[model samples]
Structure formats: structure tokens, C-alpha cells
Target chain A: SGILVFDVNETLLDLTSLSPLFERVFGDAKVLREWFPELILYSQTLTLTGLYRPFGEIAAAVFEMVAANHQAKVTPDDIAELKTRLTSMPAYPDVAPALTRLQDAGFRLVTLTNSAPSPAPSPLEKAGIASFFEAHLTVHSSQRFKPHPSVYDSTAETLGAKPEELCMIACHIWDTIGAQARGWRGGFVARPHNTPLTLAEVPQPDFIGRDMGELADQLIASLTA
Target chain B: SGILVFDVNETLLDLTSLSPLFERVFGDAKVLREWFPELILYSQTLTLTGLYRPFGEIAAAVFEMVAANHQAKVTPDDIAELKTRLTSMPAYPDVAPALTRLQDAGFRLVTLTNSAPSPAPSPLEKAGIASFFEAHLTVHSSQRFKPHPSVYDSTAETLGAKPEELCMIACHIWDTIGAQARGWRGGFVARPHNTPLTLAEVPQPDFIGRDMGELADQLIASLTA
Candidate 1:
């Protein structure tokens, strides 16, 4: 099974759309910049220590946390408002077009996200990119988050794909690092504010791009070869 | 070997002392909150995925990355200024007094920091609390950051103590959880901006305190029992 697994959120959707809400709650839009990485810090922390929590739950808690740190009070409605904004976020303009190219190339595109499985609604479907994906793989089944080897291994198992047959593409360098550590090929889509860490101790991605548009071109040439 | 391992940064030293440097470099002092967590995020992410970097190197890169996000440029001088402030951070008002109490109670105090080995001077010495610790245990030998089991295991091995005899005290919830998962008792010193994760899938710390003084009181009462 030749599969391309994409991590959601910053890798696919434009997270900056949620900035105004953060500005209203925290008195600065840049708090979104803080909240997100702390959210990731804890997610990987929980996973590494063998603890499991749903990503949506973690997102809401981290939202409350950053709000409290700013000395502002948030009601449940404020949390709900962010979740609503999150699910309805527009894809990065480059995302869907590249997804279109990958699909047209007959790539077996699927999602392997930190977000829990559906029955839970997804930003992918809400943002109209769900049609391009054959399946939605979530951390729900693995009981761990991304960059945990288990999440990548379980996603590969679910897809009936070998690690060598799978390629993970995400804007977060950490996501691809996890997949690559598990022996999958990696594509790094360096979203603005996301940079590939150049540490030689770590494996680099097979494909690197400013966005999925450029990454898709590399994949077609390399994988199609 | 009833050893208590203290995490240096937010656990003992007041990180807010570095705010002026953050303000000078990034235009907002609050960026310290963002930069530190992103630094922690990558350290653990790298460890989870089997990558390692010197924390000092990662700290410099993340600072530059955050500065770039703010549309600010940082010369090498700015990064050096941060390291200097970081090494001279004052211990929280509660910390030294608590360390004194624990020492008088006959507890063996040691530091198990995520920061690499010495030849790199530590804040502990600069803050004048180096005399309180019997030894400084760092993650350098393990080649992994905190929350990965190896760092804890390596520290336990180095100290000639079993996990059961070790108590890790820290401001970060994730740090305590990591130590606890490896079978050490935990003390959570909830710094002003640090909060405990209440999710029950993970074990809670053996002691909880608003600061080290309160935590020291509990450790004296419970561990001395």
C-alpha cells in the first residue's frame, strides 16, 4: 500500500483565522502563537509518559490555560467559540490545490492526525478537503499522539501499509520526524512560522516545500519515478 | 538513598527574571512564555522520536525562531544576553528556604536538570544554591531529554538509588508525571503560571504545593513519617 498520510491543523488548515478570537480573549493575537506550542508540548509529554488524552480535550484545556495566564476569565462559551472556529477554518489556499494534484496522480491519500477519530466531526470535512482522502486515521485507536512511534505504527497497521510504503507530510517538523523515526518516508511542508530543524542528529524529510503545492511536485517526480 | 531531584528552571529559579531580555529582543516580554514551552516541546519531541540535541543549542535556535515569528532579527549578542540572564535567575523566594528545611531534615538534595552537563555553568551556582545540592545530574549521559524514561533511569542509576527512593520536584506537571511514571514519588510545585494536569489516566504527584515552601512542609511531614 503506497499511502500518503497528512497531519491536520497547521499542516492543512490556516490557523491564523483563529487569531481575532484570541486577541479578544487574551488581549493579543500573538497568544495564539503561545497556546498552540504549549498544546503540542503537553500532548507529546502526555504521550511519552504513557498517558492518553483526547486532542480536542487537550486543546480546550490549553485554551483555558493561556487565557488564565493572561489574567482573563473565559466562559464555556469562549471555549466553544474557539472549537467552532477551529473546525470551520479555511484550508491554506495551497493545501487543497496540492491535494488535488496528489489525488490526480493517483496517490493513496489519507489522514493520520492527532485529532481523535470521527463520529467526531473533523476540520477536513468542514473545510471541504475530506473528499480527497480515502480514510481518516486518528490517534483514538492508538491511545497516543503524534511523534509517538505507536501512532505512526498503528496508522500503518490500519492502512495495511509497510513503513517503507508510507509517506507522512505535515507542516510541523516534529510530525514528520516521528513518522520517519518509525521508518516511513517524510515530506515536510514548511508552513510560515514552521521551520525544519537542521539538526544533523535527526533524519531529514525526503521532500521539502514551502507548501504542499511544492511538496506535491517533488512527490510526483520522486515517488512516481 | 532518599534523594530528591529538583528540576532547575521554573521549579527552582524564577524564569520571569529573564523577561527584560525577551522584551528587548522580541518587543514583548510575554514571548518568554511562548519560547520556553516551544523549547520544551521540541526537546521532548526529539527525545520521543529518538533524536537528541544539546539543550543550549536548541534554546538558541528556538529563540531565533520566535524572534523571526515576531518579525524581529536577533544577532548573536541577543542570544548571549538571554543565556546570561538565564544563568543568573534568582531562586523563587520560596525555594532556598525550602531547600534549607529539606536539608536540615536530612534529605539528600540533588539536581536532575534537562540542561546539559557542567563546563556549562548552572543557575544553581549563580543563584548561590549550588551548596544545597550533593550532585548535579543532567540528561547529557542519557542523550535524551526529560519525560523520556532513559533520562530518569540514567539519573537513578547514577545516584545509586532505586526509583522508589527518589522524589522529583518540579513546577511543570509534565516533569513530575515523567518522574512518577518511572516509579519515583513526585512533588509538584505549582509556580504562578504552572498548573497540574488533572487527567486521571496519569498518576498525580505525591505532594502538591503552590511553591517550594509549601511542598517542603508536605515532604517533611510525609517522607519523614
Candidate 2:
């Protein structure tokens, strides 16, 4: 009842880092938004076809595909360098304060990221919330990524909490859907202006909020209740 | 001469099709043999990680690792049925005779495999004259499976042959490898064993020998030459 789970990318942190890069690369902030789903879909393609590759590599390749779609001559290396910057980019303004509030409330907070270890730590450090987490988990640890059930289970097992006892807070609806479906409490922080609505086959989140602080309030209540 | 080619499966089938079954059930024969490398590595953590399962399940898990390593719980039917009669099955008899004659005629032959369609065919189907080929080959068709030099280049270009000038013979090496590797000559037979060595990464056989009887004399002359 005392565990709080935070999804690193957009839930607590502002993913504004990618906005500028995408704007510069594609002349539009929506490039990443447009390309991200394809990147994830392609990553799933690797799994569906029985394969694995670093997320960064997959990201770069997808970016290249996007570039090619537009007849842009961007090389894979260009996209790779940009991904490095994107991952290392800053967190939202609300992240640190919200995390502090949750930590001070006697909550055991953990971070679950789909990103791999080599690049995962940078964001937490840059966001300056590294100290708040009792454990930081990456899909790499479980060798499984999000939207698949195992990552959530592994996270729950590592944190020693039942799925229901843990509240998964994320900016993405699909992530929350996965968590909610697994019986974990789910919360969504709306960051991007037009993040997609949740799809079918995923459960509705138990909580929804506009920002990390708002989401944290719900988590705190759930834990106490 | 600088070309490095191989065969798929036993030599490029990727075996992703069996993943659904493996994730649920925890074991499949093709998945087991193919997952050997990772199984050996994961077994090292048994004592420290406090996790252990049957080698077959471990192999199934490893096979799952091949795609997503996502901790998907494969069903028993998935694993049991995964032992398809066709997988790891033998290749056509003509493979040996044709491959031998081509090798004997001073053309280097490599077998490539991704492990999907079958691996046993690499040696077994051609077991009649397995001694003739120079090497084997296989690659991730989409950079999801082996030599991701490029989905096509990894297998077809490994031999450094212009796709067209270079003839590729196999039951299955991704057809895309043949198509993209500079439009190299490609052939397919009815059997999965006849899939393609390029799919496996086996060196492109100059001519796929469909019927040993049809090309018997040509094979003998090529071998003796």
C-alpha cells in the first residue's frame, strides 16, 4: 500500500528535450510524435520476428525511415546523435518537487523505464531526482520492454509489492493501460498537447491527472487508503 | 573469395513464428536448440539470481529473449505444438549433389541459416555431400535476425557477389535478401527445406539443383572439374 511507481519519460519529466530536436531535424515538433509510434511498432516488429537491438539503434533506423519518407538525406548517424541528446535531455519543471513531495510522504518510489541501462541513468541524473528512488529499473534488467506484461511484473517483484499496491504513473496512455490491466493502479500525466487516447486490450487507469504533482496526490491517497 | 556467407536455421529462419508458443509454454525443440547460446549465459546467474527452470523452458525463455525477452508466458500447447515436424527437418537430396558440383567446379559455397524454417537441412538435406560446400551463412533479414549489414546485404552481399550475377539457391534465406542484394538470382522449391541458404546465409549456390537426376551428369563434371 505504500509503493509508488513513476514512469520516467513523460510522466514526471518534461520530454521537451525531444521537441526542439525534432523541430530542428524535421522542421516540426510533431516529427517525433509522428515517428515515435512507428519506432515502437518497428521495435515490436523485431520482437515479433524474433530479434533484439538497442532502442537507440531502433530509434535511429526509424528516424532514417522517416527521413526517407520525406526524401530527406539524413543518415542514421545523425538520428543516433540526436537520440543521445534526447535521452540526456532535461526533465519537466515539476519533476523534482513532485518526487520530493512523494519521498517526504514516506512513500517507496521506484522508476520504471523502457530505456536500457547505458543511457537510462542520464535522464534521472539530469532531472536531479536520482536520490528519491529506492530502486531504478530498466527494461534491460528484465530483458523485456514495456507494453509487455513482464516488465511490470519484474518491477513489482523487485519492489516487493502486489500489482494493486503499486500505482504506475506515466504520461503515455498505453503504458498506463498495461499497468492497469495487470491490476496495478494507473495514473496518466498529460504532457504532450495531443497524446493519444488509450486503445483497446488495455485497462482504464484508476487515476488521471494533468501533471506530476496532481498524479502524485492521487498516488498518495491510494497508498494511504 | 572475400565473401562470407552462411545458411539459415541450422545454418536464417529466425524462428520467430514459434515465439508465441515459447512465451506461453516455456519450451520448443527448435526454440531449445536455437536458444542454446543465451541459455548457457543465463544459466550462469542461476545461483546468484535465485532463478532456475528446466533447460527446455530456459531454452523457450531464451527463444523469447531472441525476440523481446519480455517474459511472455507461453502456453503448454504453444510449446508442445512448437515441436513442429517441419522444423529442424531435412533438406532436399538435390542440395548436396548440386552444392558439391558447384564447389568442386571451383566456386566457393557457403550455407546461411536464421533457424526459422530448419537448421538440420544445412547438413542433413545436403548430408549426401555435405563435404562439398565452403561455408554457411545467415543474417537478420530486417536487421532483426543476424548480419544486419543491411537486411539484404548481410546474407547476399556477404559473398560480395552482384545479386544478379551471383545465383542464390535455397529452400529459404529471406527472399528480401535475394531481392535487395542487387537482384541476385534466387530460386525456391516447394519444401521448407528448399527455403533458401541465403535465408540461412549459406553461400548462394550458382544453380539450385531441384532434381539430382536432372543435373546428375553436370554435377559430376562440375565436381571433377
Candidate 3:
């Protein structure tokens, strides 16, 4: 059976928890729509330029930019609070149960995240699901962010699996596309605002589910069959 | 000496002309800020995925997404009109004089844009600066977008110059970072809302100027000296 790799951010954790923070910081919850994408954009920019920084730091930089654009001042306390919220993101209700189901079905599970190593532990522990994953992989180890082939290939190598022997599951189309491009099977969880890009002609993910439970169900059926 | 490569959008062309379109479509001229970054994010997504689509098509896709998020309808004619506007961006006032000054200094100038070959000619031609550039290179030719080293390297190769014998000038920090990482000298035009990412420890650009004219003056002094 192939190793099932999970993308930790929106795939398992609901970022909407930060909506209240955006609302408080920028005077509108919808600003998350802008903030998240800009954060990803800059993150990729850092990777493409051969630079390395913790993803949370990148998030803060983009937050400052977003606040500046809105003519809002963000204090040190505001930033500290946002970083705290990032590490305390609540896992989606379906996530723990799905991980349990997959593990019970004899599939090895692990998390691959763009988050830095230091901040990743608390989130998984706080969500009370740290025991479900065998290991946590961060782009920090490779010094390259996800969607860079190096990150995927290196993660698979570190996990002692051939690229094709691993499957990447994520809520983001770009993550799936990256995994697929690097010869890993992909599962796409269609969370809100996480639809596939219509213009891209990349390989379709092996599984498309609306939630973690549904994706786990599909993986179980396919792997057992 | 090195060929001077310019980034067309925002660096040379003033995109504020389309602020009215965003005002008309999304009810806020400020939506340009949101729309532009989203468009850029998706364009990079396509590149990272080994997929290729024209920059204008990516722009259209992002425009529709932004419109949908705001619950607005974008007709085909509206998309058509947006494409038209894309090809008719006005050259920033400083752009023409800077191009003239640089050309008179015996430098070969060209454009390396993320825009596809099809839509690039008109914007340069319409802005009345087409004759100033010896060539217009697009990411379309390489099927890779900017901030990917291949785009910069391949463009330099195609222009018959070594990577070190080229200097990239752009309003976007990511673009300059990519160029610099690939052994090119960089000139950053610090336009409003465009700033270097604090987290990225990239090589500093050879020149940083508020506008093209200042960049050209610095470039002339440096090259001639």
C-alpha cells in the first residue's frame, strides 16, 4: 500500500477560524480572501528565488502589507496574537476520524506542511491528532517550499518511499498539481474556495472528495480493492 | 555591455487605467489591487504545475473568480473589453524618456514580460514605445512564467547574451529577485505598493529607483563609469 501524505493547512485545519482575526485586524472578514492568496504568492516567490523563511513569517509580512493597503496599523501585539491563532487552528471535525479510519485500514499517514518545524508541533498536538501521524514533514527541512519539485521528492525520500509509492492529499489544487507533477498520486479535498483551476491541464487527482471522511472512504476502498 | 530588460506591466505601463474597469465591475477601484495579485498568483500556479496559458487568459480566469466571489456577473463582452484594455495600457510618463535616454547611451533595450506573445505587441506599440525595444520576449515562448529561473535564463540565451551580461528592471521585487538569482544584474523600480519581501535574503538589486527615469540615470552613470 502506498503512503498517504497529508497537506496540513486547509486540508485538515479550517482557516475560517482566522476570519475573526481578519475582521478585527482589517475591519472585514472577507479580507482573508485577499490575505491568504497574497501570502501564498509571496511564499512561492521566496521559493522561486532560492530564499528560505518560515511560512508564518511570510504570513505576517503579507498581513502588514494588507493592513497597509487598508491604511490600518497593526501593533506588535496584533501580530503576536495572529501567530498564536495560527498555531491553534482547530482541525476540521472529519480530520481525526478520517486519520483513524485510514490508520486502522493499515495505511501509513504523515503530514507535509509549508509551516516551519517549530510551530507545527503545537497545532497538531493542540488538535489532539499528533498521534495519528507517523512523522511531520516541513518545507523547512528542504529549505524549499511546496510546489517546488525538490520539496516533494525530498519528502518522499525522507519517508523512505519512492515518489510513486506516496499519495499527496490536500485542499489546494496547486499542491495536488505539484505532487502529481512529481509522480505522486493526488487526492483533492474540495474545501470552500479550493476549487481546481479550470485552465490547467494537469493530471486529475486520483480522489476528489468534499471532506476528509469522504476522501478516507475512497482511499480505503481503492487500496483494499 | 549587458542588455537592459524591462518588465512591461506596472514597471513601464500604468495599470491605473483599468482602475475604472474594476470600479465598474467590482464597485471599487481598489479591487485592482486584489485582482492583480490574484491574477499573478494563478499565473505562477500554472507555471509551477508545468502548465501553460497566456497571461491574458489567466487574467480573465482570475477576473471571473473575483467577480464570482463578489457575486457579480462578467459577460463575455466584458472579458473581451478587459483583454482590449490589457493591450492598451498607457506607458508611464517616465517610461518613454527613460527608454530614449538609455537608448541614446548605446544600450540595447528589450522587454521580457509574463504576457503572451499575442497580446504584448500592441501594448508596447500603443503606448508609443514599441520602436524603443529591440525585442519583446514573453514567458509564452518558454511556456514558463517569470520568477522561474528558466524564464529569465532562456530569455537571455535567446537574446544572445550570457546571464551575467543582462540586467533586469522591474517594479516587482519577485521579478528582480528571480533575475538576480540567475546571475543577472537587477534594477528595482520601487513603485507604490511594490516592496521587497523582508523575509527573503536575496542579493540586493544593483539599482533601486522611484521610477524608470531615475533607474535609467543610475544605469547610465554606472555603465558609463
The candidate maximizing DockQ is 1
> Could you give candidate 2's per-residue lDDT for residues A19-66 as a string of tens digits?
776676677664564456545544443433334566666666666656
Q: Residue A12 lDDT in model 2?
A: 60
Give lDDT tens digits, candidate 1, residues A32-137.
Answer: 8888998999899888888888887888878887676667889989989988887778888888889888888888999888877656456888788888898988
| Candidate whose TM-score is highest | 1
What is candidate 3's DockQ?
A: 0.47
Give the TM-score of each candidate: 0.92, 0.50, 0.88
Mind giving the per-residue lDDT tens digits that candidate 3 earns over A136-201? Answer: 888977887778888898898899898778999998777888899988999988777666555646
- Ranking of models by lDDT: 1, 3, 2
If the candidates were sorted by their DockQ against the true structure, best first, what order would they fall in? 1, 3, 2
lDDT of 2 by residue, B30-149 (tens): 333224434333322221122234334444444444433323454555545645522534444455555555454565665554433235654335344445555454332332232222
Estimate every model's Cα lDDT from 0 to 1.
0.85, 0.53, 0.84
Off by over 4 Å in 3: A67-71, A119-121, A221-225, B20-29, B64-74, B104-106, B119-121, B162-165, B220-225
Displacement of the residue B122 alpha carbon in candidate 1, Å: 3.4
Native-to-model Cα distance after best TM-score fit, residue A9 in candidate 2, in Å: 1.8
